[model samples]
Structure formats: structure tokens, C-alpha cells
Target: MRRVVGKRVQEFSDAEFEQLRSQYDDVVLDVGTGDGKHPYKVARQNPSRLVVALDADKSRMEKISAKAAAKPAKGGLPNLLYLWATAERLPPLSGVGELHVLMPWGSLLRGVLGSSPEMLRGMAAVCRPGASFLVALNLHAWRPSVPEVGEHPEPTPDSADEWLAPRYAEAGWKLADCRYLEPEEVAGLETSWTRRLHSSRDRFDVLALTGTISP
Candidate 1:
């Protein structure tokens, strides 16, 4: 598999990858990890689990990856890794325990919102059976005012439920839960994007979708 350390990209051969894989039981992937803070924090707090932060653009992740790749005395994280890849083309592996997509925008957001089969199917391909998926969407991108609780304003030309629920099912993801995240909830998350979003606006809507990938 491909991994990033500092500003350099490295490959882990199967045998070498297995050695690192054996040290942890759970692998958590943070997709669209801008600045790579969420996975870094998760790795430090849960030393037993391996956390992978991935993004298509390396420029946003360079500084954090450099710090994470440093020696322990200099604030390095042994269990955290950075991968340079887009959502549709994940690494060829199959042990992801949990997957997170936080505040995604641009192509990443479009894929999820449109329920692009390629992207969603690829996400399922890299997961262990029954892996969990959590996606935090910025509602402000769709509407300025937050929709009423549990209500999603008509997303596109079609109705919300028509596009939102059925498409996920078609892509092997079952939407198990949905809720609106309060401003404080968004502010409390350990990600640079979340913090920046919170500071830039007083109240922004965040929709959290939690689901399980079908076997």
C-alpha cells in the first residue's frame, strides 16, 4: 500500500505492510482529511488503533504529515499515517474498521451527495465486513438557514429522500442514523476545518450521517 511520511511518498510491500498491520486490530480512515488533524488526534488518544488520514491534495497535508512522521521525542505518531489518494481511488486494502468524511467539499462532497456508485463502491471495497461509515456534511453549502430538525431541504431538482436514502442503499451503504450537529458539537471536534468553520460563523448546520456497509 502507499503511505506518506513528511513530504515524501513511500510504498509498503505486502510483507512489510503485514508487519505493521499486526500491531493494531482496528484501522480508522479519515477521508478528505484537510490538514490531517483529526486522524493525528485519534492516533494519539487511541494508541492501540491505527489511523490513516487521506486527501487528494498533498499541499494541505504536508506540514502535519511532517510533524507526524517525526521522531517520538519530536511529536511523531507511530500509529498515524498519511495517504495521498482521492476518495474514488483508495489504496488496495480491506481492513478499515471505521471511515469518516468530515466537512467534505468539491468533488468529494459531490460524490457523496450525488451518491456516485464508483466512489461509494470503492469505499466499500476497502472495508472489513460491517464497517461503519460516518459523514459530516456542511449544510450551509446547500442552504444558509438550517433546515428544521431531521428535515433536509430539497437538495437538487429532486426530493431529499429520493436522492439521499435510495442511492446509499444502491451503493451498499445503509443509512442507520441521521441528525443535526449543534454548533458546539461541531466546534468540539478535533479537526482544523471544524475549528475554522466554527470560528468563521456563529451557527452553521452540520448534518451527520452514520451508516454501516453491507456485507
Candidate 2:
């Protein structure tokens, strides 16, 4: 598996990966972790849980990865890690306990909305049996909307869960919950995209879909 810190990318052998996994009771994977704020915070707050923040674009994670590397001298979190990989190509040894896809855009977001079989199967392969998966998307993105600043606009899905549940079932995942996020819940979101959505004048509805991988 490839781990990224600042501008450096390093490979972790299966032995090293297993050794690290043994130190934690649970493994949390944050996919499409742009800038990696959520996983870093989760790792800091929960010292016993190993949090792996993964993003395909390594450059986007450089600043936070550097900060994470520097934190160990100051009694920093040993549970936090950053990986350079896409959602569809997660490491097989990950054994994820909890998977989070927060405000994803592009291919990842499309996979979640359309329930692409390959994408779901890839996610299932990296997770342990019965692991939990949570995917959150902007409600505004479900309908056509203007692009945010420099970002490209994504197409809206007709019905998020309706389009996704059957696909998840086909991929050996049972739909656990699907609902709109309330104001208080949205206020507690700790990612860059959440902050951006909050700042915008447009109403932001967060649709969270939760599922469990079947054994």
C-alpha cells in the first residue's frame, strides 16, 4: 500500500500493514479525503481507532500530511495515516471497520449515486465482513446547480437512495439507513466541503446513506 506524507510517497508491505493494524481496535477509512481534515480530527479525538485518510490526488493532502508527520514530537496521534489511492482501488489489506465518503465529487460521487458495481465491489473487498459504510452527498448536487467558484458542476441524481440501495444489495451490502441531515447535524460536519456548503447562500441538504457489508 502507498502512504503519502507531504510530497513523499512510501510503500507499506503487507507485514508492515498488518503490524500497524494490530495496534488499533478499529480501522476507519475516509475516502476522497480532500485535505484530510476529518480523518485527522477523528484520529486525534479517538486515539484507539486507526484512521486512514485516502485521496487519489496526493498534492491535495500534502499540507495536512506534513502537519500529521510533525505532530508526533508534540505527543501527536499515532493512529492517523494518509494514503494515496482512489476509492475504486483501495488496498486489499485495509480491513476497514468504518468507511466514510464525505461530499465526494467526480468519479467517486458518481459511483455512489449510480451504485456502480465495480466501485461497490472494490469497497466491499477492502472492508471486513459487516463493516459499516457511510456516504454523504450534497442535496443541491442532486439537482442541477451552478458550479462552485472554480469547481466543475456535477449532475444531479433523480433519487439518491432509490438509485443506490438495490446496487448496494447486489454488491452484498445491506442498506441500514438513509436520511437527510438536519441543521444541527450539518453544523457538526467537520470537512472542507461541509464548511463550503455552509458558507454558500444556497440551501444545502445532506443525504447520508449508511450500509453494512454482508458476511
Candidate 3:
């Protein structure tokens, strides 16, 4: 079996991550901080900022902590704190003026999540009314049943976001209106679906939902 990616995914650029961190005067909560790279990148820019990284695997979290410690500590890497926790059970972060949720792809499969509704509800809890929640999903996993992949049922657009969106709405969140850069909407993206939509533009489903995140 060949590897899909030669290395770990780059979640954010150093500058972009820094700009995101600067928004909050208080600490931020980054879910699934793999090897702590995103936090490291953000910390590299704003060393004084505080970041709380939570992951279930204790050993892996420890390794990331060690890696940060061994660094040269120039601006003094952001205070990256680790907590032994699963995504469904994010550690308490009450009182923090702002909260950022990096709900990326590491935890997507419905079966593995046990109960996604419960997990999402739990996520909505820890923050105060004004805090922000960012839910990110990748359309890359969208697939149609192909025989070559082996004996499995055909993949369908299960309205994954649709199921989760209402929960946030009932929580008193107003979906902010924003302009989207659709494949047809962009200049060069105005090409054949067979050429552009199938390959070159497959990695992103960047939807920015404000108070409420819908499918």
C-alpha cells in the first residue's frame, strides 16, 4: 500500500497561525494538536501567548511536550500545555475570554466517534456565550463506491454537517453571513469539473461558520 502523504499535513502557515492567535487576548484551545506543530508554529510567532493542546494519547502528548522543551527557546515558545483528554471530553477551559476549536479531520468517522451528537454537544458546553467555535470538514473523503477499493458499500453524502448544524443553532448561535470562494466563483477555478474539481482543488472544504456551524 502506498502512502497518501509523504509527511504530516501542514494545518496552517506560520504567519496565518500567528494572525489567528493575535485575535484573542486570552488563551486558546486547539483540538488534536498533532505533534504540536500548529501550536509550535503559532507559538514561534507569539511566544508569550498561551495554548492548551488536548489529546487522548498521553505518550504522544508527552513527546510533543519534550520536543518543545528541547528547542532553543528564542522568543520562548508559547506556553503550550497538554492535557490527557479525548475530543469528546475536552478539558475545562471556562472563563477564558475567547476559545478556538480546531475541529479538523483526525476525528471524522462516525463509527469511531461512538456518538457524534454527544461529542458535539460537549464541545458546545465549555465556552461562554460570546466564544467562537470553528468546525472544519474535508470533502476529500467524499467518495463513491468503487470496486477497486474492495468490498464495501457505496459512499454517500450523509449530510454530516447537516446533522451537526441544528444542535449549534438550538444553542443560540447566529450563523454569520460571509462570502464564499466556490470553485465556480473563483477566476481560474472556472474550468471543467473533470479537470479542476476532481484533483487540484480537492483538499479544502473551508467553511467559516460563526455562532452556528451547519452541514
Candidate 4:
């Protein structure tokens, strides 16, 4: 896998990768991690978990990856890792205990709305049995209507349970709950990207889809 550390790309062999995860209690994966802030916070808060922040485009994450790869005394996180890859072309990694896709963009947003079933299944294949998942969707896409949104309407909690749950089931994801996230809840996510979206509207603007990947 291509690992990004301090503005450099390091070729990580499988042997070395295995050693990294073996030391952690869980492997936390953040897909489409813009700027890589979310995983950085997770790694800082939970020292036992290996946090991998993945983004197809490494341009945004390079700065934070530099900080994360520094020494612990200089506010670095040894457990934090940056992976350069897209959802469609994921790396050969397994045993992901938790997955997060916050404020997805481009094809990623389309895939999560059930437009791309294989994308969902592909991600599920890499997780450990019953690995938990969280997807925070920005509902503003539908307010102006973006092409990526496609035919899926802005999902309410009950509507998602009725409509999207079956779609998730087909992809080996058990959609346990879906609902609107309050501003405070969004603030708690601790991501700079998400905080930018918070300024959009006063009411609920983020719909959260939370579930677990099948065994």
C-alpha cells in the first residue's frame, strides 16, 4: 500500500503493515478523509486503535500527514496513518474494526446512495465480522440538487429505514439506524471539513447513516 508520511509517499510492504496493526486493538478506517483531520483526532484520542485516513487525492492530506508522522513530543500520532487510494480501487487491507465516510464527494457520494452497489460491497469485504460503520451525508446536495445525488431523495430517519435499509442489506451492510444530526452532534465529529458544512443552515443539515458490516 502507498503510505503518506510527512509529505512523502512510502511504499509499505505487507510485512511492515501487519506489524503496525498487530500493535493496535482495532483498525479504524476513514474513507474519503478530506484533509485527514478526522483520523488524526481519532488516533490522538484513542491510542490503542490504528487510524488510517484514506483519500483518493493526497493533495489535501499532505499537510496533516506531515504533522501526524512527526515525533510524539511534537504532537504526532504513531497510530495514525495516511493511505492514498479511492473507494473503487481500495488497498488489500482486512480486519477493519470501524469504517467512516464523512461528507463524501464526487463518485463516493453517488455510491453511498445505493447508485453503486459494488462500491459498498467492496468496502464491506475488507472489514472484520460485524465491523461498525458511520456515514455522515451532507443534505445540501439536494437543496440545490446536484447530479451526484441522482434519484435518491434527502433521507429522513424513518424514510431511510424504509428505503435505504434494503439497499444496504444487499451490499452486506446492516443499516441499523439513520437520522438527522444536530449541529452539536456535527461539532462533536471533530472534523474541519464537516464544521464548514455546519455554517450552511441553522436546522439539521447532515443525515447520518450508521450500521455494521456483515460477517
Best by lDDT: 4
Residues 85-167 of candidate 4: C-alpha lDDT, one tens digit per residue: 99999888898999999988689988888755888998898898789999998888788779888767888899989988888
Q: Kindly indicate the candidate among 2 and 4 with the higher TM-score.
A: 4
132-161: candidate 2 lDDT, tens digit per residue: 988887766645652331232332233434
Candidate 4 wrongly placed segments (more than 4 Å): none
**Cα lDDT of all candidates, in order?**
0.77, 0.76, 0.44, 0.87
Please give the distance, in angstroms, between residue 117's alpha carbon in candidate 2 and its true position after superposition. 1.0
Residues 27-124, candidate 3: write the lDDT tens digits: 65656554555555555565566666665555554555666545475323435555556666665555333344432444423311223355554555
Deviating ranges (above 4 Å) for candidate 2: 73-75, 145-161
- Using TM-score, give the best candidate's number: 4
Model 4: how far residue 27 lies from native, Å:
0.5
TM-score of each: 0.86, 0.86, 0.55, 0.96
Clashing pairs in model 3, backbone N/Cα/C closer than 3 A: 161-215, 162-215
Give RMSD to native, each candidate.
4.4, 3.9, 10.6, 1.2
TM-score ranking, best first:
4, 2, 1, 3
Cα deviation at 84, candidate 3, in Å, is 1.9
